[PDB]
Amino acid sequence: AGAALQIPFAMQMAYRFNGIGVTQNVLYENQKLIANQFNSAIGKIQDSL
């Protein structure tokens, strides 16, 4: 929607969680669990493919 603007990644997942009704307080308290779950899921999808 114009010119690209730099933004840290964590403060993008915060906005995306805020979008779907889950308040952003959740993300900053459980960041490591989310990272581990995402990495495990991507490994699983690579293995399945």
Q: Which residues bind other proteins (CB under 8 A)?
A: 1-3, 5, 8, 10-11, 14-15, 24-25, 28-29, 31
The burial of 41, by beta-carbon neighbours within 10 Å (0-12 exposed, 13-18 middle, 19 or more buried), is given as exposed
Task: Pick the closer one to other proteins by CB: 3 or 45.
Answer: 3
Provide, rounded to whole angstroms, the least separation between the CB of residue 28 and other proteins: 5
Give least dist CB 17 to other proteins, A.
12
CA gap 10, 41 in Å, rounded: 19
